[PDB]
Each structure stands twice: as structure tokens, then as C-alpha cells.
Short mmCIF file of N, CA and C and ligand atoms in Angstrom, two decimals:
data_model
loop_
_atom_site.label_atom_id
_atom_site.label_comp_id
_atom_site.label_asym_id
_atom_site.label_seq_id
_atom_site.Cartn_x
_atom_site.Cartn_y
_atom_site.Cartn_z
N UNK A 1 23.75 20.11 -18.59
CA UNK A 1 24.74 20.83 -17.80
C UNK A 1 24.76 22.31 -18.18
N UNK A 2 25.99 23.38 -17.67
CA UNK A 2 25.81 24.60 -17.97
C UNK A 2 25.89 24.98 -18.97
N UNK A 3 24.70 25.83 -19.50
CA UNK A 3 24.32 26.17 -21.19
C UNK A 3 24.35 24.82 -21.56
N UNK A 4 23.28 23.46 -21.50
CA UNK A 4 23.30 22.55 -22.56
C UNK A 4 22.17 21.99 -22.04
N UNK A 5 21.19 22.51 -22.87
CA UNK A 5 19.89 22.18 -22.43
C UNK A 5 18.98 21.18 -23.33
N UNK A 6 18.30 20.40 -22.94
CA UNK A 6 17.62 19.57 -23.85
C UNK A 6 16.57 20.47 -24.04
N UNK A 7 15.87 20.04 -25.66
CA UNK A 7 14.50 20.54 -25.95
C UNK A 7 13.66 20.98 -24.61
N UNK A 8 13.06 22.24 -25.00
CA UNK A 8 11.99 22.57 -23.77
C UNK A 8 10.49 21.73 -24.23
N UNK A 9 9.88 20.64 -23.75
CA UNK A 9 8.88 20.42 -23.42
C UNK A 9 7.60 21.27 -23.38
N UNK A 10 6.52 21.85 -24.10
CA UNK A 10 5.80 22.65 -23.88
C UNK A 10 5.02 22.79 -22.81
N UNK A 11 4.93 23.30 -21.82
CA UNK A 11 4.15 23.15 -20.51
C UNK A 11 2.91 24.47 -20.45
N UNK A 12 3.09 25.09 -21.29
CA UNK A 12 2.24 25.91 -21.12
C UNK A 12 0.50 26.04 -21.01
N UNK A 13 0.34 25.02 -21.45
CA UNK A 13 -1.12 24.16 -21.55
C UNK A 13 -1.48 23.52 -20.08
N UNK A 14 -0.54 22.91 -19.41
CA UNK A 14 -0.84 21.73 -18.21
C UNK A 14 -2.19 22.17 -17.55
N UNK A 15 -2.07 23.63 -16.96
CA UNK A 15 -2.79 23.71 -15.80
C UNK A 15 -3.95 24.21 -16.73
N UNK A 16 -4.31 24.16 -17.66
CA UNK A 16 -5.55 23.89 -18.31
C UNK A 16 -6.21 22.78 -18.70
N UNK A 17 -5.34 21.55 -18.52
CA UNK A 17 -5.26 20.47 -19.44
C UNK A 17 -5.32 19.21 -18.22
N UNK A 18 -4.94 19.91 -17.03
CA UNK A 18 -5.16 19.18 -15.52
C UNK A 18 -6.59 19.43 -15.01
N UNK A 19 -6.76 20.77 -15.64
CA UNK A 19 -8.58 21.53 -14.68
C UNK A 19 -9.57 20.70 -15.68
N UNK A 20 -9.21 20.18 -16.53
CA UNK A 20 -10.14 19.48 -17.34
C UNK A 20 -10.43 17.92 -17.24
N UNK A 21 -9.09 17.60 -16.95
CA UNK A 21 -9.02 16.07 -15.84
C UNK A 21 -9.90 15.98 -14.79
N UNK A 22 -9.34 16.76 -14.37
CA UNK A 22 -10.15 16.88 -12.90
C UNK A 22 -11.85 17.01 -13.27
N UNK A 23 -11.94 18.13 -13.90
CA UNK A 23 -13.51 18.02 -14.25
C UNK A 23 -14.13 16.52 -14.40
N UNK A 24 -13.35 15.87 -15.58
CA UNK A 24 -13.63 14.99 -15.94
C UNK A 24 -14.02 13.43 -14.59
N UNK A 25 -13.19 14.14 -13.48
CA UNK A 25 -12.69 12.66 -12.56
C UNK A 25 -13.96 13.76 -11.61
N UNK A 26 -14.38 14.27 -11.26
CA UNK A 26 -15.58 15.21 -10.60
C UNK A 26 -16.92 15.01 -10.86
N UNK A 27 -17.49 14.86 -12.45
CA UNK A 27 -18.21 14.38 -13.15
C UNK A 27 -18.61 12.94 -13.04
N UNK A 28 -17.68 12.09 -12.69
CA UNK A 28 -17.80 10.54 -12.83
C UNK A 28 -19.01 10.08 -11.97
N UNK A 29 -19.48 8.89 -12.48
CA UNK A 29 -20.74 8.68 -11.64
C UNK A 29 -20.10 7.46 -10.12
N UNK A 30 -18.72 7.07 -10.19
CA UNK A 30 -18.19 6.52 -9.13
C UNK A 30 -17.03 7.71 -8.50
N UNK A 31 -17.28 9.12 -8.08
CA UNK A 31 -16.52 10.08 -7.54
C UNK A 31 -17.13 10.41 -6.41
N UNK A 32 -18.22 9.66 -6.06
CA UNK A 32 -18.86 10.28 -5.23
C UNK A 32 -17.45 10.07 -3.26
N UNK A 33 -16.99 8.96 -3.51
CA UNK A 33 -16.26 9.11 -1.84
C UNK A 33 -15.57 9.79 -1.77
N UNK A 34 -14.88 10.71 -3.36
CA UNK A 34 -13.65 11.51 -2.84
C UNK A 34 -14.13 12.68 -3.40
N UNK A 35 -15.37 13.40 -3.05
CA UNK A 35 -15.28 14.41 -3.54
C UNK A 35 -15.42 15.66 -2.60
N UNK A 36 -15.15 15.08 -1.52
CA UNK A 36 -15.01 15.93 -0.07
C UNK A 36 -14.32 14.92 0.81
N UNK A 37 -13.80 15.76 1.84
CA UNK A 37 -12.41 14.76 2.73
C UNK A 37 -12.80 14.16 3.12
N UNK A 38 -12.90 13.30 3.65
CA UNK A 38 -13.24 12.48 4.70
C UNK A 38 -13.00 12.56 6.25
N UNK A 39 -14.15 13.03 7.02
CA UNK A 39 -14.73 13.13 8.13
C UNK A 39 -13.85 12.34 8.83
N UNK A 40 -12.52 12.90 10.03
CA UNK A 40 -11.36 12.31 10.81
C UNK A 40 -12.03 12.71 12.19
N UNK A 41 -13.68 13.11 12.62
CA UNK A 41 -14.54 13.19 13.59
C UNK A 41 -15.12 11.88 13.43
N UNK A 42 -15.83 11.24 12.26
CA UNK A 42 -16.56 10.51 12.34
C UNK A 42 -16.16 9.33 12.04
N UNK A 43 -14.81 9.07 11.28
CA UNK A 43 -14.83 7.92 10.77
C UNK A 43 -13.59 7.59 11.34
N UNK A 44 -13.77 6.42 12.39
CA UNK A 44 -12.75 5.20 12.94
C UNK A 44 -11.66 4.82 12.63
N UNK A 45 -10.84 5.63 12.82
CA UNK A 45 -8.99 5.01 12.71
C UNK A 45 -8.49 5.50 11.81
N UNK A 46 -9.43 6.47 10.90
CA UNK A 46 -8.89 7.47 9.83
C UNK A 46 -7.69 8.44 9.63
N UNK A 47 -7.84 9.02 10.93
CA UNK A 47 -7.33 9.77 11.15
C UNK A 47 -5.74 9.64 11.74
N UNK A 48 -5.71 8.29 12.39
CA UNK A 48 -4.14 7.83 12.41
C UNK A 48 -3.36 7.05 11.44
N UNK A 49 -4.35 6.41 10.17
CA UNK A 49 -3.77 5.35 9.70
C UNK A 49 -3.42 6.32 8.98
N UNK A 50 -4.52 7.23 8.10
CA UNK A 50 -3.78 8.12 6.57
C UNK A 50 -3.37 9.24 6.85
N UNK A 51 -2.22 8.80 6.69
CA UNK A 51 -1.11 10.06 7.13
C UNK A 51 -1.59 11.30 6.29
N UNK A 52 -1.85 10.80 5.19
CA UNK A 52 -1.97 12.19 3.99
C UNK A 52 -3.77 12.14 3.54
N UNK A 53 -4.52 12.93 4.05
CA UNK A 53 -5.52 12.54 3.37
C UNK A 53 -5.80 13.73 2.30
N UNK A 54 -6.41 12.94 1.24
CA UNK A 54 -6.85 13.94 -0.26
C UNK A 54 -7.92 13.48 -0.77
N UNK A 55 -8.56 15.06 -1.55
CA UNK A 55 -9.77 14.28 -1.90
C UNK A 55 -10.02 15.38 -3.30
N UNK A 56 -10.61 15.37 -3.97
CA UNK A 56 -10.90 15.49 -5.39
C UNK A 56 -11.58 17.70 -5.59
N UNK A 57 -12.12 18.17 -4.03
CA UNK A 57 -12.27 19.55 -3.55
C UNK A 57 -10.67 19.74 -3.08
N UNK A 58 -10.19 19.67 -2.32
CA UNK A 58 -8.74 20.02 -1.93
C UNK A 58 -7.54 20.02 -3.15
N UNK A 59 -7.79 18.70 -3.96
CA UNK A 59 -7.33 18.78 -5.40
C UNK A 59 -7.29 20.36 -6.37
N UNK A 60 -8.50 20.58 -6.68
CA UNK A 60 -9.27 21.59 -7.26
C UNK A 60 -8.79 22.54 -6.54
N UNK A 61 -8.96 23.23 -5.00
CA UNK A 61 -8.28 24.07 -4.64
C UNK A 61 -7.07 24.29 -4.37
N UNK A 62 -5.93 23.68 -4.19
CA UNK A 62 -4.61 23.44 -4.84
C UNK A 62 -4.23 24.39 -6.06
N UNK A 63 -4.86 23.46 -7.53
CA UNK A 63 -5.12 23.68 -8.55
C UNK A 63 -5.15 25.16 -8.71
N UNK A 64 -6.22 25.69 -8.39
CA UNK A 64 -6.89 26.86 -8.26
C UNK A 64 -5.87 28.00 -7.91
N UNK A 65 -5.50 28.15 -7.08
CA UNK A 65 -4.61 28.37 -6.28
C UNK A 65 -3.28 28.45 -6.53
N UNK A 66 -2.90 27.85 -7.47
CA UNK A 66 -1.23 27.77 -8.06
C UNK A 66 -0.18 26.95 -7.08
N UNK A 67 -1.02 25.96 -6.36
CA UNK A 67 0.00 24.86 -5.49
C UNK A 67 0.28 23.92 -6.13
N UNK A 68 0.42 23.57 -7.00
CA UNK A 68 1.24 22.43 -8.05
C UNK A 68 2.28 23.33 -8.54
N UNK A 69 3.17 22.80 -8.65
CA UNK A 69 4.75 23.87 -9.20
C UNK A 69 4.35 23.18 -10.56
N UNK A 70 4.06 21.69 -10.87
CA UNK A 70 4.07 21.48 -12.40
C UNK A 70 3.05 19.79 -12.45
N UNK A 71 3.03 19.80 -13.83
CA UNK A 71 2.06 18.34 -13.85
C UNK A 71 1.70 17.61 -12.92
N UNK A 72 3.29 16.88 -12.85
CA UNK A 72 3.53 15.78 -11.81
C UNK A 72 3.28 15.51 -10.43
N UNK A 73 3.07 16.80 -9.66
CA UNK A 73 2.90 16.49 -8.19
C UNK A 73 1.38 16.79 -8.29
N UNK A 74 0.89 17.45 -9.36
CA UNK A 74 -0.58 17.32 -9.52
C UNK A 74 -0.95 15.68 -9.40
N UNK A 75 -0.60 14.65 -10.04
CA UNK A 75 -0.92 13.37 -10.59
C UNK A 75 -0.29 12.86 -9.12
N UNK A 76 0.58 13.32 -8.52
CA UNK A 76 1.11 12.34 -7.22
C UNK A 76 0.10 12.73 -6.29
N UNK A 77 -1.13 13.72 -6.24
CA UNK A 77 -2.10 13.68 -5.69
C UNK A 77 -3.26 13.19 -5.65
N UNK A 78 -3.24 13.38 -7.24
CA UNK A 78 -4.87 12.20 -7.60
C UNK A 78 -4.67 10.48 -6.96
N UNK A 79 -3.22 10.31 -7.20
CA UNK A 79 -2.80 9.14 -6.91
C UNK A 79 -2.70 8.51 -5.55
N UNK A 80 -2.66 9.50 -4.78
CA UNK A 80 -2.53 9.55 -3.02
C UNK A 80 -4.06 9.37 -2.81
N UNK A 81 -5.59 9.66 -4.26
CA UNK A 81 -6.77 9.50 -3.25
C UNK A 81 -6.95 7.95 -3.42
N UNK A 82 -6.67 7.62 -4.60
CA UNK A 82 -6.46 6.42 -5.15
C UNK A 82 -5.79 5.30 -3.97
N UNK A 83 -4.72 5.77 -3.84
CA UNK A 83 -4.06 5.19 -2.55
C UNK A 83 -4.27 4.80 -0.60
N UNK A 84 -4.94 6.07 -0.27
CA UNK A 84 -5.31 6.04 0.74
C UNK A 84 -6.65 5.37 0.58
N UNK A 85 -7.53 5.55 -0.64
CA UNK A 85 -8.80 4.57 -0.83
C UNK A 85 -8.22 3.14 -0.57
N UNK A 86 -7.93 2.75 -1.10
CA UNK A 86 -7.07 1.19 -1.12
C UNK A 86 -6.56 0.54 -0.05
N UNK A 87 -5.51 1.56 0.75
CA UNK A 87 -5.39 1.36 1.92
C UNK A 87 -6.75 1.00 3.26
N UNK A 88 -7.32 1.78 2.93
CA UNK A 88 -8.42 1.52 4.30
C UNK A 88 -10.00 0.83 3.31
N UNK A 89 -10.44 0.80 2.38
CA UNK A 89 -11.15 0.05 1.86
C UNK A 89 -10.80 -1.17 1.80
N UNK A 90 -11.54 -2.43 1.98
CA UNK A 90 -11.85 -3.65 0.85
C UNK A 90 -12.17 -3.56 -0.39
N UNK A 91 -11.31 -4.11 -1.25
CA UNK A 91 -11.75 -4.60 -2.26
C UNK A 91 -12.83 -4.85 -3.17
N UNK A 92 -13.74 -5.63 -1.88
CA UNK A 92 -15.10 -5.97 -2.05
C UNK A 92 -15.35 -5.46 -1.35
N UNK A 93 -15.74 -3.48 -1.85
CA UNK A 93 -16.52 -2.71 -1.33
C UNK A 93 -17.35 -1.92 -2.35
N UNK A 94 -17.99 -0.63 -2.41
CA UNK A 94 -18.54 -0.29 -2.97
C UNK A 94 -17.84 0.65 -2.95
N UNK A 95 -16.79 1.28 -1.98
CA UNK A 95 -15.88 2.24 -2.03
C UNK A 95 -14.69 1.87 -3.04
N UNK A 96 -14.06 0.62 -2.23
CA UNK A 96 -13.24 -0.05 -3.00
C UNK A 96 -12.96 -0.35 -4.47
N UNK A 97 -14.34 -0.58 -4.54
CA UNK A 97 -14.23 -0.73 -6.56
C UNK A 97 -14.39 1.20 -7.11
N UNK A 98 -15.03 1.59 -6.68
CA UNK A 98 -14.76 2.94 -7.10
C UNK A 98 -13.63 3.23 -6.99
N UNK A 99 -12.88 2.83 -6.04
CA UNK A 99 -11.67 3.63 -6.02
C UNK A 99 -10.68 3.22 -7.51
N UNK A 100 -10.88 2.08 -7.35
CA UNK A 100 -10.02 1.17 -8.68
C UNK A 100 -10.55 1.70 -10.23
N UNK A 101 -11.99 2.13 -10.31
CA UNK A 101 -12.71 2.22 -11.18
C UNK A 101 -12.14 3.47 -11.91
N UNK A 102 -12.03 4.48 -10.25
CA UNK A 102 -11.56 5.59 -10.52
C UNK A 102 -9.89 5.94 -11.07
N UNK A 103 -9.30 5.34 -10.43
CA UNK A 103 -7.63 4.62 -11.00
C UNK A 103 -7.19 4.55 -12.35
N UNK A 104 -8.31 3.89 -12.83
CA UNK A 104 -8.28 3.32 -13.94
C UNK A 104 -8.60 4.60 -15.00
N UNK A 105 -9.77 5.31 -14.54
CA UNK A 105 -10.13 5.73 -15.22
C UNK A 105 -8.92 7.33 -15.25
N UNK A 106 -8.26 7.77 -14.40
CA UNK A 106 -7.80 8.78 -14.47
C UNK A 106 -6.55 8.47 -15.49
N UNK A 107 -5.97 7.26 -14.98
CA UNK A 107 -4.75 6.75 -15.89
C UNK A 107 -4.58 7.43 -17.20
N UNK A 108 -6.27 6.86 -17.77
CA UNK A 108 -6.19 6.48 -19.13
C UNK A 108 -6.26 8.12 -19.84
N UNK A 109 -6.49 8.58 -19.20
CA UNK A 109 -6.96 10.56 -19.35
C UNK A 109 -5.28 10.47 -19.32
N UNK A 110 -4.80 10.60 -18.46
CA UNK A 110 -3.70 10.60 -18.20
C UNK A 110 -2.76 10.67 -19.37
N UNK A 111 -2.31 9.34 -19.81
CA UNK A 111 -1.91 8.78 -21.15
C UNK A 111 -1.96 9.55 -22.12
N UNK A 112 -3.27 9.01 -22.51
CA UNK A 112 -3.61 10.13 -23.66
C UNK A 112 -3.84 11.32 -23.56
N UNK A 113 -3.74 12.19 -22.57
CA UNK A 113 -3.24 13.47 -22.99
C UNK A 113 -2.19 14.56 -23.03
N UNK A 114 -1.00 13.52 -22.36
CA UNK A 114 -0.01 14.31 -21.99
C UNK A 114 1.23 12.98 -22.09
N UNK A 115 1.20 11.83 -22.63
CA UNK A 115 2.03 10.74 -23.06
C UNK A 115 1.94 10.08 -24.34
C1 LIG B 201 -12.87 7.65 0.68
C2 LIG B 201 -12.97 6.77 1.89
O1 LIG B 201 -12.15 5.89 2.12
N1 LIG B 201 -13.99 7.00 2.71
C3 LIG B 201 -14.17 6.31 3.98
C4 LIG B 201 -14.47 4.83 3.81
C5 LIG B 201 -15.27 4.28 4.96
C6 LIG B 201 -15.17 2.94 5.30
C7 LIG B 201 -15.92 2.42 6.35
C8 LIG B 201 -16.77 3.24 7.06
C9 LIG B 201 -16.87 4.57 6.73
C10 LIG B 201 -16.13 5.08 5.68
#
């Protein structure tokens, strides 16, 4: 409340500490479906079902750019490619398991470096 502030949290690191995530989720040898948008010319029903589409370049330029106000809506984005993958993939796909692969793998970056 007014004047009663909890400990400040150090944030001064994030957007160094996010560009390195990202590197890391860019690098992966299963990044290849989200590392450019996905084609709403070419690909069938895309374009009405995912309301929000994101992809791992739009991420980065965001980033870049100073469009994350802080951590968190950074991570509610990685999470939206994660999501809209899921949504329109199977499971038993080759997209599909990347996407999960990829899930998994951002989590754990995640965790350990900022929980
Ligand atoms: C990242 C992502 O979901 N890409 C599109 C998946 C896709 C599925 C079927 C045909 C073409 C394309």
C-alpha cells in the first residue's frame, strides 16, 4: 500500500537473460516450425482458427524492440507458440512432438533461471 513496499526483486538482468532463452529455443534442433510465422496464404484454416499467431522471429523482434514491459508477458508469448502448436497439430505429428519437445524444453530454462 502507500509507502509500504515489499523487497524490490532485481529485474535488471531479464531482458538479457530472456535474449539468451530465446537463443537457446532458436538453436534447438526441433525449432524448426516456429521459427517464422506461419503462412495464413498457404495453410488451411489457419488463419481463422489462431486468433493469435506467434512464432520464435516476431518473439525476437518484440524483444528487440522493447515490447515486453517485463519477464512475464515475454513467457505468455513463448507459451502462445506452444499453444497455438497444440491447438492445430496432432499429437502424432512431427510438428506436434516438437511442439511439446519444445514446451518442455523452454520450461526447464525457465525454472532454472529466474525461479
Ligand atoms: C507451427 C505450425 O503449426 N505450422 C503449421 C502446421 C501445419 C499442419 C498441416 C499442414 C501444414 C502446416
Amino acid at each position: 500500500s502507500m509507502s509500504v513496499k515489499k523487497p524490490k526483486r532485481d529485474d535488471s538482468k531479464d531482458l538479457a537473460l530472456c535474449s539468451m532463452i530465446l537463443t537457446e529455443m532458436e538453436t534447438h534442433e526441433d525449432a524448426w516450425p516456429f521459427l517464422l510465422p506461419v503462412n495464413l496464404k498457404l495453410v488451411p484454416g489457419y488463419k481463422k482458427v489462431i486468433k493469435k499467431p506467434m512464432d520464435f522471429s516476431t518473439i525476437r523482434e518484440k524483444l528487440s524492440s522493447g515490447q515486453y514491459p517485463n519477464l512475464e508477458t515475454f513467457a505468455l508469448d513463448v507459451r502462445l507458440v506452444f499453444d497455438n502448436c497444440e491447438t492445430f497439430n496432432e499429437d502424432d505429428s512431427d510438428i506436434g512432438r516438437a511442439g511439446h519437445n519444445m514446451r518442455k524444453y523452454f520450461e526447464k530454462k525457465w525454472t532454472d533461471t529466474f525461479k
